[PDB]
């Protein structure tokens, strides 16, 4: 009933420590990913993501 | 692969023949038991036929 409730595991094979929230999608078809996107902001004050993953 | 793949169900045969080079299906059975080898064979042939 709302928007948006993303999860995570990181690369460990383990969920990241807690979910984020999925902010939007933006419909624009990626053209060379031929792909949509999902900005999902995540909160990462433990200075545990890094911008890129 | 998504976006530039797409992927469905269908059959395939698991196994393959071909006999002196053609398609074989081989298919094994035998003589009902009181009835001797050529019988069944023509039987066999005889089914085969149409």
């Given at each position: ?33 031929g ?7 995540f ?11 | 692969?998504s ?43 005889q089914?085969?036929?149409?």
């Amino acid at each position: 009933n709302g928007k948006a409730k993303v999860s995570l595991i990181t690369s460990d094979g383990i969920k990241f420590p807690q979910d984020g929230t999925l902010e939007f999608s933006d419909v624009t078809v990626d053209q060379t990913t031929g792909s949509i996107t999902l900005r999902a902001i995540f909160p990462n004050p433990d200075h545990t993501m890094m911008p890129g993953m | 692969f998504s976006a530039f793949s797409s992927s469905r169900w269908e059959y395939g045969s698991p196994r393959l023949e071909r006999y002196n080079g053609l398609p074989s299906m081989e298919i094994l059975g035998q003589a009902a038991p009181g009835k001797s080898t050529g019988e069944a064979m023509e039987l066999m042939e005889q089914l085969a036929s149409k």
